[PDB]
Design a protein around this ligand. Structure first.
Ligand code: FAD
Ligand code: FAD
Ligand code: FAD
Ligand code: FCR
Ligand code: FCR
Ligand code: FCR
Lengths: 550, 550, 550
């Protein structure tokens, strides 16, 4: 196909056509798409940012290409180095709130790895792990376990929505809610296509499986791994794995992920926190519990509107255009039988141990007045606890997508700072963020996810994607929160394409030493700068900073 | 000082002298030593390999230099870049079995970071972490906790000997025996002097602590860290920390380590396994227990001679020069009331939870005939269980150094492959290794340290350091084991200076893709190749592979 | 022609077409072929490996080009340097067992030099030599001698099959069976087209024939040579000839080969060795005889199945699918009146001298029980001795091709190590190789060719080219034999395209010094890396080792 709306920097239309003809030769016309619709979660759009925040011509692909296999990825990387064409690899492209599948540089080729590279490559019982291609969604691996009756032996760890890529979420260092919730830390053995086109396997994946008649003559991509590849992550020498998370250092084609054996007992629960100010004491109660193993998984502290929004849109609770008042928030809580803050958690393992930890949890939380405790059965049929009961045992759901529709043409953007597990710190961050949300004309909506010694505070900014004036206010809010949070010692762990530079500039101790060191590494491994230029604020030397940064 | 026994590659004597005079100017004559004695564990030697395996002129420093602070490290890196002089950074230099403090390249300057950069920088209770300089030994940190009564709130995690560096052991990715036993995984926030001499702080350490009057004007090195620096490791963007472990990518000056809060209950124990073949069933029993949390820490499976050697030398058990027979091993076991294999572990937490897990452990292990269970109190005063009882609660000891004296002029070398947590795999690796040990005229001595989905198999090769013929058999043994283990799908996790090249060559999947990628990173960050050339087999482009590899 | 199945690395289809249009301009459409059939020995296929062992897309040409003369070779080299297109020069392309005519790099242009560059350039009686182009097969030079009645004066030295190229076999350092059997050592004066396109003549070929009226104005390629060109190989200064054997240093267009004057008497013979174990004593008897001139030619020690396979396929002796047993081998021997090992040799020169050497040979071999001696006349009409009687006097035959059809879709691969001329060494190598052949499900088939102080041990692995599972077992066998033989101190002298890297890595003394030195020489003479990249494991700097090695 001939004329794309936007071409990559410095490439001619004739080179574009040459390049695209070459790719269609390799993967076929059915797998190459020239962009000469926002779609849905069900059918994610791969050409641009659906939940737009920025203006047109930002983050727009020139074409979408879907490799059939690793050989095609290597062939495409070779073509991209030949013509200096930027590539933007995605697995499933459901990074909604962070830009979807859109490229940081307009005119890039979006590399859809998941369409054809879809396979569950291995589920190992004794080693309790799985090996997956980019295309395996959490729902697919669930279905694979169920089909082979492996759910009695091994459980998954899933984020709020089931349609994400197991591998794509892990390389972004995403979060799930069982004891295996730190997705990036559960990995072991990855396969990567480097910018030079060569294939690399990390860790013990670099120790080749010994020759045998049955595996002779296989392409590198198709060879099996050695015995310790997905059991011990370090290998020998430099532990380079982390250079492939949240980065533009390579294209990930495979990954091993540790899986939790059925723990022999489970019980999810909900603790309701009556007052807005009860976040402080609750978080101080959470701290020692999280460090000591009474809280084994990644429990969450959800704000009333997050649960309210799951159950219905704004218009179903109030007809005001402005932010709901404190008083209206208390009324919604009462209607749903929830608190202003709602703590969701789970106990795993034998009844005798769960009982002891549960008494410890109840005893500690009883120090907050009017606290109430529920198990799934004690709540209504449409409750969030019933949905999260599945989530905290690794069963995928799609219920939580409903909060996005809080406003008429709801589109969401995530603001995601890290806070200490201390009531004082959490209250100060919430206060900072709640204030700015109100200055922008928006309702505060959010969760805290409880890591061991930190909390991920996920502020869900929802807005009308067709409302120009509100879109600008959303851009103001984000940028102002970034600066306010850094002035109080907090940085964000993940972001949308339009804020990556601003957030990388926040990590500027000692005159931006961190970014300078990363640029050195990027320019050495990617001399033509073809792999996702600008991902995380990391630009290759051919992309002028003056021209491209936001 | 003027004439060293060995000069670094391509440097003239006049440049050596100019350089050393420059350094003496910066750090003083008391902190600079020109090498123109093997020492002890108590006073580690910093000039060469004490437990020598290779000949003279290998791994010999030209001079030992001890920076007083980070500024001197920066100054010294500046001088090394100017003169093309290689540096070898050590923290305490007690890496016995792996080369001690000796440099990979003879003529290097050994940089003794621990002598003056010694401080316990911070012990935080609510975030349960500590921050340390290279010279903080495990014993020093212990003493610091005891002096401020912090042992009631926070425990350490220590390797077998308390004299190592908390930071140096973590960057080598060493092992300890409580639930915080994966030392490298407990880190968060590190400070590094790069080969270009610039200071860098990783993760949330890149997010600067906000300006305040009390901290104005401090040098970079002396600035405090922001609130989340030692609580959340990832920061934002590429996760580069792992490039500074088992590598030559930088000089580590500070590191944060997570510390376990007193668990509120502890009980160590020993399970004796009567037959040599009982390793198979025991490991198969261990597998599910280790994955499910009945085994929370890093339990070990010790061979009878490791415990026997702790108690006395070979001459105290037999006067044969050749390897003890199976029959003599059973006799020693009986004398000590141990089995041929001995499992040491611990339970942590409230009595009611420990009681349930202990019944689970006892019940599973009872499937092996003649199994016996002991608590520290049921054993003699000199027992290994009493020493390990302290080790598994974070208390440093020095008792285990005595197995090194198994032979007259005992020197040790560690052969350290990884195995699956499966009886079949463990037996096959032991069988391979025991056979070659016997071919070399040596006793098999070793331990398995039980990781979650893997085991580190530490084979302790001990030999008489003055016996030439035995030294050669040791060299043969090691290189043959490396090859045999690779042909059975096993690689080593850590090694001695003389075997780093051979072990990196084992990790050659896809025509050595892993080492090629590492070399590209090393040349880009260290263009003059002055930071520890050859560490882990990773050589900068100025060091010809033909000349330097072993 | 427009679209080839495979293109060379980094070249566009438009450049391919440009290049191919340019070549068709030079040599004509009849001499250029675009590959958009395994053929036979009679009509060798020039596009791929017929006796396939590896999978599709390996060793596949993009086009076959046939120069009309040396000017076209130079023009084509110029075009290849202009577009960076790899060339794979062949003479006849009958390197069956070593890859046929197939290129090491898929997408290469196969340069068929023999089609049009065919001439016997000179046969000199007084100097006893010949001068040949790539296209002269052993059968053609035989026919040339016969046509001009030169067989009474000069004899040839031929390998087992008559259709090979005299020059192609010599540059591979092939073997023949008269006293002139070391083909490479019989050469003198070669003409080469270098990678830069320039013409070079080696040795005394560099000393120009003095001007004369009759030779003025001839192109360099067409000039005659000086008097000593094909009589003394060294010339003056560096003796560079050997850089053009088994290498990618140049394209050979002409070569002088020494020819043996009729020796005035000849008699071939066969000595049958009854037992499998008789190889040991026989080889020990051969040693002093070979060194002293009782054995003047290159006598061979053939295994019973090699002779059996010449006479009929496996199905004609047994219907088992598995390897024939020892007992069945003894029965075949008895049926053919041969031993388990069969020694073929010849005596040259006057009757009185032959008689003396023959008595010496008989006397020595009589030390082995049940030895029998035959002359051609004492054997049946279809005997191997009758075929080899022609071979050892330089007369070409095609009988020996019949062993390839031992299995239904027989395809062969040669495993070719060198052994000492000692019974102990030969028995150990045979034992090693026989064992592995049996593990793969294959019959051991082989010969030893007796060089002066070494033996070439040619193991003929034959397999069904359509049997996937057996193909993989063949790949396992080869690679395992390579490693087993190097661990016992033996290397291979020649190999198939798929094992060249593995065999070059075996020659790694002093950290691969040999290959590093060869790469330095290759990159200097061939800066664009267009001449047979990868031949012998020698890759030019533009071919990433990670991507291309096998
Ligand atoms: C309602 C809602 C709830 C959510 N809940 C959670 C939650 O609980 N936890 C959570 O972590 N997230 C959550 N998310 C965010 C996001 O939806 C998920 O993280 C999702 O899994 C990310 O998308 P994906 O897996 O489809 O990844 P992708 O879009 O495919 O990938 C994300 C990014 O990873 C990189 N990448 C992906 N594949 C590759 C590859 N093969 N090679 C190189 N780089 C690659 C690219 O930079 C890419 O843009 C939520 C989102 C919404 C709307
Ligand atoms: C009897 C015995 C038992 C042992 N038991 C254990 C055990 O249970 N667990 C275990 O893990 N080990 C064990 N070891 C091995 C060793 O004793 C410890 O690992 C010890 O802590 C390593 O020494 P150090 O801490 O003195 O480190 P150092 O020698 O200071 O350092 C080791 C290496 O780390 C790198 N390095 C160190 N500091 C820096 C820096 N500041 N910058 C850059 N690079 C740096 C260098 O490559 C250096 O050579 C044992 C050894 C013996 C003899
Ligand atoms: C049954 C059987 C028996 C055999 N017996 C023998 C034997 O007794 N002795 C023996 O030596 N071999 C033997 N062979 C192997 C092979 O068949 C012969 O060696 C044959 O002569 C090699 O092929 P060719 O002459 O057609 O050469 P080619 O395929 O033309 O050339 C072989 C290689 O030489 C190089 N080369 C060729 N020409 C040039 C040139 N002009 N410039 C630069 N490089 C060039 C290339 O690398 C090329 O691939 C046997 C094979 C079989 C199947
Ligand atoms: O990055 C993230 C992490 C968690 C979530 C949520 F909201 F489900 F908790 C959203 C985005
Ligand atoms: O690298 C290591 C790890 C463990 C040990 C031991 F033996 F104490 F377990 C020694 C060396
Ligand atoms: O390279 C060679 C040499 C000899 C032979 C044979 F078998 F005729 F002896 C085959 C291949």
């Amino acid at each position: 196909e001939f004329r794309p709306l936007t071409l990559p920097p410095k490439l001619s239309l004739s080179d574009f056509n040459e390049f695209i003809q070459d790719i269609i030769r390799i993967v076929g016309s059915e797998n190459v798409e020239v962009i000469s619709v926002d779609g849905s979660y069900m059918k994610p759009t791969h050409t641009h940012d659906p939940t737009h925040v920025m203006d047109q011509d930002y983050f727009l692909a020139s074409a979408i290409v879907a490799p059939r296999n690793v050989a095609d990825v290597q062939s495409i990387v070779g073509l991209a180095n030949k013509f200096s064409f930027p590539l933007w690899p995605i697995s499933i492209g459901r990074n909604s709130g962070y830009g979807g599948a859109a490229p940081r540089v307009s005119g890039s080729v979006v590399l859809d790895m998941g369409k054809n590279m879809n396979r569950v490559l291995e589920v190992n019982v004794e080693g309790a792990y799985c090996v997956v291609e980019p295309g395996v969604t959490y729902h697919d691996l669930h279905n694979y376990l169920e089909a082979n009756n492996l759910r009695d032996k091994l459980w998954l760890d899933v984020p709020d929505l089931g349609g994400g890529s197991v591998l794509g979420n892990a390389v972004e260092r995403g979060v799930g809610y069982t004891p295996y919730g730190d997705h990036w830390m559960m990995h072991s053995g990855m396969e990567v296509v480097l910018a030079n086109g060569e294939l690399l396997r990390t860790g013990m994946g670099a120790l080749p499986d010994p020759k045998r008649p049955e595996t002779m003559g296989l392409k590198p991509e198709d060879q099996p791994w050695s015995k310790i590849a997905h059991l011990f992550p370090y290998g020998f020498g430099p532990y380079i794995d982390g250079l492939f998370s949240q980065s533009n250092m390579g294209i990930v084609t495979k990954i091993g992920i540790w899986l939790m054996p059925n723990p022999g007992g489970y019980q999810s629960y909900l603790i309701t926190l009556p007052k807005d100010g009860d976040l402080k004491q609750a978080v101080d109660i959470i701290r020692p519990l999280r460090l000591g193993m009474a809280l084994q998984n990644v429990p969450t502290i959800r704000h009333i509107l997050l649960d309210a929004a799951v159950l219905g849109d704004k218009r179903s609770y109030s007809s005001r255009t402005e932010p709901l008042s404190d008083e209206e928030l208390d009324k919604i809580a009462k209607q749903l039988n929830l608190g202003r803050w709602n703590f969701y958690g789970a106990l795993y393992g034998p009844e005798p141990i769960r009982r002891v930890l549960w008494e410890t949890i109840k005893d500690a939380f009883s120090a907050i007045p009017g606290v109430k405790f529920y198990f799934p059965e004690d709540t209504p049929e449409n409750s969030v606890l019933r949905v999260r009961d599945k989530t905290m045992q690794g069963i995928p759901t799609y219920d939580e997508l409903k909060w996005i529709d809080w406003l008429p043409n709801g589109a969401h953007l995530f603001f995601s700072p890290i806070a200490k597990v201390s009531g004082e710190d959490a209250m100060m961050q919430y206060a900072v963020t709640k204030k700015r949300c109100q200055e922008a004309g928006l309702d505060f909506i959010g969760t805290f996810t409880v890591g061991m010694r930190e909390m991920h505070h996920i502020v869900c900014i929802v807005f009308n994607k067709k409302d120009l004036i509100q879109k600008r206010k959303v851009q103001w809010l984000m940028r102002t929160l970034i600066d306010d949070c850094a002035a109080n010692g907090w940085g964000e762990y993940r972001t949308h394409l339009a804020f990556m530079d601003q957030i990388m500039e926040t990590y500027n101790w000692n005159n931006s030493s961190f970014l300078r060191f990363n640029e050195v590494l990027k320019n050495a491994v990617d001399p033509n700068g073809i792999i996702a230029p600008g991902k995380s604020g990391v630009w290759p030397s051919q992309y002028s900073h003056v021209t491209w940064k936001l």
